Amino acid sequence: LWFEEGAEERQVLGPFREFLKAEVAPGAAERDRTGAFPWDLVRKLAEFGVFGALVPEAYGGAGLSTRLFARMVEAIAYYDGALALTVASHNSLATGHILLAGSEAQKEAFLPKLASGEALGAWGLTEPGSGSDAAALKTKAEKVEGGWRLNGTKQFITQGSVAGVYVVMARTDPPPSPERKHQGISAFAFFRPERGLKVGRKEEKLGLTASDTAQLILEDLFVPEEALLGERGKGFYDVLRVLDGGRIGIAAMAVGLGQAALDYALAYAKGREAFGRPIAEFEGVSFKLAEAATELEAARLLYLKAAELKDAGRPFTLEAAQAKLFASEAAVKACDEAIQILGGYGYVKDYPVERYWRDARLTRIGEGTSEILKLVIARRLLEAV
Amino acid sequence: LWFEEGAEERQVLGPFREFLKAEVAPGAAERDRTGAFPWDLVRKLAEFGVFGALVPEAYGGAGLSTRLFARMVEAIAYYDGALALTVASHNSLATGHILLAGSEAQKEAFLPKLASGEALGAWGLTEPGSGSDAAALKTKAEKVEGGWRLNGTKQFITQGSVAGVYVVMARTDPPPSPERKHQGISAFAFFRPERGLKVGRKEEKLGLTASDTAQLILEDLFVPEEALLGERGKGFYDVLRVLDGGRIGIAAMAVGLGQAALDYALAYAKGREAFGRPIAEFEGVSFKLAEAATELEAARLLYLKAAELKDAGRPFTLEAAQAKLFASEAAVKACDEAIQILGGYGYVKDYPVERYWRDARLTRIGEGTSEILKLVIARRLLEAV
Amino acid sequence: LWFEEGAEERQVLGPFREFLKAEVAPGAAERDRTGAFPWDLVRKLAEFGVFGALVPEAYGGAGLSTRLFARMVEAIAYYDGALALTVASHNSLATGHILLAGSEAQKEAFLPKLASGEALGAWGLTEPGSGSDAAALKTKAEKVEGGWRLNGTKQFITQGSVAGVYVVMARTDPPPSPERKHQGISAFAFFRPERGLKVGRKEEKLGLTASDTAQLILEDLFVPEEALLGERGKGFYDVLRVLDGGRIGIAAMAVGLGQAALDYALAYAKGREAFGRPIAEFEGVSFKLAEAATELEAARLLYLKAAELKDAGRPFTLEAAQAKLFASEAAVKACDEAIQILGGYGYVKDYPVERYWRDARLTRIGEGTSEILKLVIARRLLEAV
Amino acid sequence: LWFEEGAEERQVLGPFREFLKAEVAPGAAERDRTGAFPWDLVRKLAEFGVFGALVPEAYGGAGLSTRLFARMVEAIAYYDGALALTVASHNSLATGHILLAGSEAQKEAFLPKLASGEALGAWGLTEPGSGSDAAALKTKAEKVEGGWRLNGTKQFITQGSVAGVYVVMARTDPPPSPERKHQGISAFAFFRPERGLKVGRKEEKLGLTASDTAQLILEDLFVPEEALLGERGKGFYDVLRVLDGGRIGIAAMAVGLGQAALDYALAYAKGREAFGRPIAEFEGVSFKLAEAATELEAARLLYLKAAELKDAGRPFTLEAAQAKLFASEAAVKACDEAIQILGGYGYVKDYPVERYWRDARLTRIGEGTSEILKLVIARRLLEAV
Ligand SMILES: [Cl-]
Ligand SMILES: [Cl-]
Ligand SMILES: [Cl-]
Ligand SMILES: [Cl-]
């Protein structure tokens, strides 16, 4: 059945899950406390193709279906949000943009390593002054003999550090209309330079501790002519496509986190007793479980659908935005109800439910805030009829 | 393509919807205020075999999948909630119960007429004293020479006054334990008796006005031996199975109504302007549209999944409950938002959104209230911990 | 205590409530179905001075505080939403506007009749082409010799067909910029004219059936020079003030309806039995009752506060908007839950909960939609800081 | 006006707020990271009579009204949630219980030090096994020669490790029916003992880092005859009253935290812009601001109401529970929306909104979970009429 794991998926997810429980799960709590970038697990995960999941085998990638890649992200997120974000962003953003707008030359130069894991990718779109209106990037890319002169600063760029390959957006030409500033922007891919690129101090986050998020400062950074990704002044349109893909991944990440929280509360409730009976026998508890279960089930069907469309070469901007919005909002709520079901213990770090919420909370913000996705969704509904 | 309409589905739905737009849509508003049972449309719908949708062609049915049946219910609901309910209940309860537990002789005796729509089916389970706790039925059936004697009252029976075939659940033997009243109940299928069955006045309802609803008073009704449907005292297990199938139909009915409300508000939002601009541009309206569209898509995926599981012969109690719960809640909220988007006009009957809400409101109550469904969902979740 | 009914309030409300239970309550169900305007009740209510609640006794009014008037509206709404709306609108809009901006000559000419209930007042602001954007009126007032000429259409006017006194807002002077349209609007108060005013047919509404609502068509209507209410072109500033007073009344109306719904559901749950126990013992029901009671208590405190501010001649735009927004949303939700608690019975008109919801649904739309109020609130909040 | 700060209240709050801004606010973020108990602030706060707020001047207290104390708790929670919990618990629980059930000897013995802050109080009710169903305590008190011997474990006890005075609930007599264990419990008040009391082992919390929270291990702890607080075996009844008072404190704590988050998002929104315009100009943002403001105003009115009923010596179990439930749920919601409004910066610890949520999250659990409170409210509503 379509909504279930096919025999081909059950053969890739089966062994991937064992690995997750044995090498990722045990150190999840500690990593949330330490915040130490898990280089080991990254190289260890790359083995399953995880870091080149969507890259064609020809380029070294594992050439998997966007559908399969999503289920793996869910699986990773079920045990470690931080890792899930690293994996999802690396593939969806940095790698995805290169594979999407890269020439055969650019692809050959980056994809093999990215898909390998020996080089992590950073996607610089978000800046300090434009957390939502992306097209309003102030980072510049002035034409210079030999290449370009990138001048600007990126903010909250996943893999800001630890990044071997970078993809940065920058305006190279006028909008011209202040409105449509989406035109005039260009994308530039390149390897970690040795001058002109400063990596700000590590940002302390509410959760996803171990994930790498840094500020990027570009002081007169030169990039070869071979850096421009896509058509000059048309990179933002490739950006939107990349995000659509990214959103599918984030949705799966959300579901993973929400499912973990739910499974935990389910088990807890069945055991924990109050007033002479399992707290689960109380509707106040059962209703929360039922609601969460139902919504996460719907969240999953939504990203599976979005992934199915993407693989079919059909439009999915609306469907990816719908999946991300729903999974994110539903997961965070399920996580919050888990905290409530655990009661006083839900408030203590000894248990995972508080981390689940902290990790999942970012899914309603990253790669398009829920508010942003609703406008995206509404615009599509309206332009349709 | 799983989530989209297939070639065989489209072959049926394409012409079916054309018929709905031309023959059903014109008079839905009028039927809502007069409550006049559309015998005309019943016969016309019956030409598409929709009154015996899940019945095998061998028995005069259309032999459709539960997936296609559900999509057709959704299509009808989009234009007329009362008709959708008429179709969904006739098929799922009375007809479905006979198809499920009926011997080959009973199926040959009842299905042909039920399937052709020549005789509508009424399913009498609910009583003035028990709805959610159906197992607490008070109606009784005494084994008499030549058959049985029925005595009791049924409440809120769809098609109660217009049906040619009746399926009634009644107590035949003690629990014997008060904790398990479910055991000891039996079902009886019989044609409209000339004596012994008194129909109460058509009750005034909040919505679904043209849907036939009535109280049934059984006074020493005599039914022959061939009336016993399923094992004596085992009727409740068939009831539960019938309800699982019925909930899929109700979920699709809700999606239909919610989709209609949303599409209406969209059209309105795109045209009606306030403060010098289409009200749709205001995030207050856009957010409502986005949220509703997103939940309805999820709702449809949920019932499709449940239908798929039922057709595969696999368990779907949990999945049918989840579909019905989510669909009804989502649909009702979308209808309430449509009323809000239309503002003052949403409060007047010259427009359909106030009717969409009144019609859909029943979906959160019939065939298992949302509260009942959450318990069903929670219990299933707890048994597979 | 402040939040409780004081000595003078109780001396008024004690006998008022006894009157409502015996004279208003018996026929509320019938009025909802027939829509017949209750002239007998209007007259009886008027003997309590309720039709001139806030009008100074010097002008034939009752001279009550806004706090007491609000409690009275709540009391009426508990038994008949239609009547509560009639009382609230008559007092807050037409009467309130004349009381607020009228010269002593106009007050003496109109208030005595309005305050005794001899003449009901209609306030025409909303139009077919504009509701929330009231300043975008199309109705026009032409300065003529001896008075003015009115031409335009008014939509959904309370008491529009039964009013003996009208207050109509019409454009008299062109606004400067296409933004500050709120300037250049004027108000006119006059008795029902023999010619010039055509009342459209009573509109069919979702609820508040017996409430008089009509469209007004003004064709070359001549009003004497004394009809001008307030400074020419400055009428919209009085409108905004009048609306602030109106929202307090509507908030109280909502509390009344929601409280009636909750009280009924409470009574039912205590008596209705399921699974061997009163439905109230199930947290699925108890939670609904608790949340509703809590929000209604909060809603009441909110309108009481705004009324106190108004009585103190203190600014209350923000506070009245908060009360109306919270009360309407809370009351509507409590009514929806009361329907759910009654299950199948909640869907039939033999019981009042379906009427409570239909009646209360208007409170989230009239006098400014919840969306409009949130903007009003957001803006006030942003100014102070 | 009632709902506003009166002359006597403003005399205290004006200087108190100046103190909070200057002394408490600057170190809040750091304390959330270190968890270091702020002894200097405790001492400075005590100078305001804050640690003996409800204690009569006769016993060395400040002798303030419950509403003034509540407003002071809200004011503190506005800048430091941990400190608010410290003040609220010390006053409401340990001190409140002694003031309530203590004899003149006991009050004279404990209140002076508690009220001056020279001795902080710990209240031991909750245990690793019984939280919600508190009457199911396992700690035991055995009557010995000239006193009692206590044995048990208390968990999540505020001020548990820094307290100078302890109040512990322990069963001294068997209950007649397990369904009513509320009978047979006793309370014991004593100073920090030399032996018999072992401090738990600091468990890390989601928020309120610097608030002292610890497990208490009682090993054959001896307490004199004069340790028994209240009547033997009737302690739980005083416990229920203590909680009613405590809930008012917690409600105010929630409001303070929510207001802080709202004000922050309010200030941010006004400056920060998106798409070439302040994000507050977007209804997505403005709607959030309006909803939270309205609910917080409602929450504040509810706790002021409960506070006055208690001060008036009237019933307030229902009202304190309503206030605590509403405020806690509303505050946590406002804090989550604040995080959302800040977007990416809402997820970084450099800004306070994430801490506001973490601190506020406990108010929905402590001193009776929202679920427990709803049952309390429902029981009262039902026992009513
Ligand atoms: Cl399709
Ligand atoms: Cl009162
Ligand atoms: Cl104040
Ligand atoms: Cl005081």
Do the beta carbons of residue D230 and residue D186 sit within 8 Å?
yes
DSSP B199: E
Task: List the Cα angle D289/D295/D301 in 5-degree steps.
Answer: 135
Q: Does residue D305 come out as left (phi exceeding 0), alpha (psi in the -120 to 50 range) or beta?
A: alpha
Ligand 1 centre to CA of B300 (Å) is 11
Neighbours of chain C (3+ CB pairs under 8 A): A, B, D
A243 three-class SS:
helix
Q: Angle, nearest 10°, between helix axes B66-79 and B283-311?
A: 150
B257 Cα: distance to centroid of ligand 1 (angstroms): 17
**What tokens appear for A52 in the block?**
């080149």
Q: Distance between CA atoms of B374 and A293, rounded to whole angstroms?
A: 10
Instruction: Kindly report each contact of residues B59-62 with a partner whose C-beta sits within 8 Å and lies 24 or more positions away, as own/partner.
Output: B59/B99, B59/B107, B59/B108, B59/B111, B59/B112, B59/B115, B60/B111, B60/B112, B60/B115, B60/B116, B61/B111, B61/B115, B62/B115
Closest chain A residue by Cα to residue D282: A371
Pairwise CA distance, residues D158 & D91, whole Å: 11
Number of alpha carbons in the 13 Å side-chain half-sphere of residue D352: 26
CB D155 within 8 A of CB D215: yes
**Looking up tokens 């008012």, which residue turns up?**
D248
Contact check, Cβ <8 Å, D287/C378 = yes
CB nearest to B343's CB, from C131, C276, C344:
C131
D93 touches chain C (CB under 8 A): no
> What residue of A is the nearest CA neighbor of B312?
A1
Chains that touch D (3 or more CB pairs under 8 A): A, B, C
User: What CA–CA distance (Å, rounded) separates B122 from B150?
Assistant: 16
> How big is chain A, counted in residues?
385
Q: How far is CA A178 from CA A175, A182, B218, in A?
A: 6, 10, 76
Residues with CB under 5 A from ligand 3 (ion): D 4-5
Rounded distance between C-alpha atoms, residue C94 and residue C55, angstroms? 12
Ramachandran quadrant class, B296 (left: phi over 0; alpha: psi -120 to 50; beta: rest): alpha
Q: Does A284 touch chain C (CB under 8 A)?
A: yes
Cβ of C309 within 8 Å of Cβ of D375? The answer is no
Task: State how far residue C256 is from chain B, nearest Cα, in angstroms.
Answer: 20
Q: Does D284 touch chain B (CB under 8 A)?
A: yes
Dist. CA C93–CA C28, nearest whole Å:
24
Q: Which residues pair with D348 in a beta bridge?
A: A205
Report whether D171 contacts D141 (CB < 8 A): yes
Neighbours of B82 (CB within 10 A): 28
Of all residues in chain D, what percent are helix, strand and coil, respectively (each to 5)? 60, 15, 25
Please state, in angstroms and as integers, the Cα–Cα distance from residue D18 to each residue in B235, D23, D50, following that order: 74, 9, 15
> Token pair for residue C238?
């009085």
Distance from the alpha carbon of residue C363 to the mean position of ligand 3, in angstroms: 28
Residue ranges per structural domain of chain A: 3-120, 121-231, 234-382
CB contact under 8 Å between C287 and A284, yes or no, is yes
Residue D331 phi/psi, 5° resolution?
-60, -45
The interaxial angle of helices B7-19 and B66-79, nearest 10 deg, is 20
Distance between CA C66 and CA A191 in Å, rounded? 72
The tokens describing C106, both together, are 């106009």
Cα–Cα–Cα angle for C359, C360, C365, nearest 5°? 105
Torsion-angle region of residue A268: left (phi > 0), alpha (psi -120 to 50) or beta?
Answer: alpha
Query: C56 C-alpha to center of ligand 3: Å?
Result: 30
* CB proximity list for A160: less than 8 A, separation 6 or greater: A122, A154, A199, A200, A212, A213, A214, A215, A216
C61 and C112 Cβ atoms separated by less than 8 Å: no
Q: What is chain A's Cα-based Rg?
A: 21
D370 with A207: Cβ contact below 8 A: no
The two tokens of residue D127 are: 């245990």
User: Which residues in chain A are contacts of D349 at CB distance < 8 A?
Assistant: 204-206
- Secondary structure (DSSP) of C57-87: GGGTS----HHHHHHHHHHHHHH-HHHHHHH
| Crossing angle between the packed helical segments C317-342 and C235-271, to the nearest 10 degrees | 30
CB B310 within 8 A of CB B324: no
Q: Which of D219, D367, D371, D383 is catalytic?
A: D367
Question: D210: how many CB neighbours lie within 10 A of its CB?
Answer: 24
- Between the alpha carbon of residue A304 and those of residues A3, A69, A71, A248, A298, the distances in Å are 7, 10, 8, 8, 10
Q: Tell me whether D290 touches chain C (CB under 8 Å).
A: yes
**For helices B370-383 and C283-311, what crossing angle results, to 10°?**
130
Contact predicate D286/C375, CB 8 Å: yes
C-alpha D84/C-alpha A83 separation (Å) is 36
Q: Are A256 and A76 in contact (CB under 8 A)?
A: yes
Q: Which residues of B touch A132 (CB under 8 A)?
A: none
CB B96 within 8 A of CB B125: no
Within D176-229, strands assigned E span 185-191, 197-199, 213-224, 228-229
Reported in sequence order, the residue ranges of C32-184 that DSSP labels E, i.e. its strands, are 121-124, 140-144, 147-158, 165-171
* Cis check: omega of the bond before D38, within 30 degrees of 0: no
CA distance B21 to C42: 46
Q: How far apart are CA A76 and CA C70, in angstroms?
A: 58
Range list of H helices, B2-140: 7-19, 28-34, 39-45, 66-79, 81-89, 96-101, 104-116
Query: By the CB < 8 Å criterion, does C286 face chain B?
Result: no
d(CA C154, CA A16): 68
**C134-159: b (≥16 Cβ within 10 Å) or e:** bbbbebebeeeeebbbbbbbbbbbbb
Distance in Å, CA D67 to ligand 4 centroid: 8
How far apart CA C45 and CA C39 sit, in angstroms, is 10
- Cβ atoms of D69 and D45 within 8 Å: the answer is no
User: Hey, is the C-beta of C349 within 8 angstroms of any chain B C-beta?
Assistant: yes
Q: Which of D254, D294, D247 is nearest to D96 (CA)?
A: D247
Residue C153 annotated in ligand binding: no
Residue D234: count of CB within 10 angstroms of its CB: 17
Q: Cite the active site residues of C.
A: 367
Residue of D nearest to C307 (CA): D1
Compute the distance between CA of residue C306 and CA of residue C326 in angstroms, rounded to an integer.
Answer: 12
CATH superfamily of D3-120: Acyl-CoA dehydrogenase/oxidase, N-terminal domain (1.10.540.10)
DSSP state of C55: S
Q: Any chain D CB within 8 A of the CB of A322?
A: no
Candidates D292, D376, D131, D36; CA nearest to A347 is D131
Question: How close is the Cα of A239 to the center of ligand 1, in Å?
Answer: 28
Going by C-alpha positions, the residue among A134, A152, A154, A151 that lies closest to residue A142 is A151
Instruction: Determine whether the annotation assigns residue C148 to a binding site.
Output: no
**CB A150, CB A171: distance < 8 Å:** no
Q: How far apart are CA D157 and CA D85, in angstroms?
A: 11
* Secondary structure class of C278 (helix, strand, coil): strand
D182, D130 Cβ separation under 8 angstroms:
no
Please tell me whether residue A109 adopts helix, strand or coil conformation.
helix
Residue C259: phi and psi, rounded to 5, are -65, -35
Quote the CA–CA distance of C348 and B204 in Å, as a whole number. 6
Burial class (CB in 10 A: 0-12, 13-18, 19+), A9: middle
Torsion sign across C-alpha atoms B254, B257, B260, B265: negative
**CA neighbor of B353 nearest in space, from B29, B34, B36:** B29
- Compute CA distances B246 → B240, D1, D380, whole Å: 10, 58, 39
- Interface size B-C, in CB pairs within 8 Å, comes to 102
Q: CA nearest A288 in C: which residue?
A: C284
Q: Given D343, D350, D371, which is nearest A131 (Cβ)? A: D343
Range list of H helices, D80-197: 81-89, 96-101, 104-116
> Which chain B residues contact residue D287 at CB under 8 A?
283-284, 287
A284: chain C residues, CB-CB within 8 Å:
283, 287
Give the alpha-carbon dihedral of A313, A319, A324, A326, to 10 degrees.
-150
* Tokens found for residue C317: 């735009």
Q: Which residues are CB-contacts of C285 (< 8 A; sequence separation ≥ 6)?
A: B371, C269, C279, C341
Name the residue among D4, D302, D304, D293 with its Cα closest to residue C312.
D4
Partner residues linked to C127 by β-bridges: C130
Q: Is the peptide bond before B15 cis (omega within 30 degrees of 0)?
A: no
Please tell me the distance in Å from D131's CA to the nearest CA on chain C: 19
d(CA A117, CA A51): 6
Q: Which amino acid is located at C231 in the chain?
A: E
Reference C205, options B257, B355, B79; nearest CA is: B355
3-state secondary structure D250-279: HHHHHHHHHHHHHHHHHHHHHHCECCCCEH
Residue A348 contacts D where some CB pair is shorter than 8 Å? yes
- Please tell me the class of the B121-231 domain: mainly beta
CA–centroid distance for D167 within its chain: 15
Feature table: binding site of B for FAD:
123, 125-126, 132, 158, 272, 283, 340, 344, 369
Inter-residue contact B153 to B218 (CB < 8 Å): yes
Q: Does C6 touch chain D (CB under 8 A)?
A: no
Q: How far is the CA of D3 from the centre of ligand 3 (A)?
A: 7
Cα distance between residue B140 and residue C154, in whole Å: 60
Contacts of C78 (CB under 8 A, 6+ apart): C20, C256, C257, C259, C260
Q: Is A275 on the interface with C (CB under 8 A)?
A: no
* D61 three-state secondary structure: coil
- Of the CATH numbers 2.60.40.10, 3.40.50.2300, 1.20.140.10, 3.30.2420.10, which one belongs to the domain with range D234-382? 1.20.140.10
CA D55 to chain CA centroid, Å, is 16
Q: Write the CA distances from B133 to A135, A284, B92, B128, B320, integer angstroms.
A: 58, 20, 20, 11, 19
The CA distance from D342 to D355, in Å, is 13
Residues of B in contact with A299 (CB under 8 A): 298
Are D373 and C325 inside 8 Å of each other by CB? no
Count of CB atoms within 10 A of residue D146's CB? 8
Measured CA to CA, the distance from residue B321 to residue B338 in angstroms comes to 26
Q: Give the contacts of B145 (CB within 8 A, at least 6 positions apart).
A: none
How far does residue D64's CA lie from ligand 4's centre (Å)?
4
Residues 6+ apart with CB under 8 A from B291: A374, B337
Q: What residue spans of B201-352 are helical by DSSP H? A: 235-271, 283-311, 317-341
Based on the number of CB atoms within 10 Å of its own CB, is B328 exposed (0-12), middle (13-18) or buried (19 or more)? Answer: buried
Q: C11 in contact with D at a CB cutoff of 8 Å?
A: no
Name chain A contacts of C287, Cβ cutoff 8 Å. Answer: 283-284
- The whole-angstrom distance between C341's CA and the closest CA on chain A is 15
CA angle (C29 as vertex; C24, C30 as ends), nearest 5: 95
Q: Identify which of C294, C301, C325 has the shortest CB distance to residue D377.
A: C294
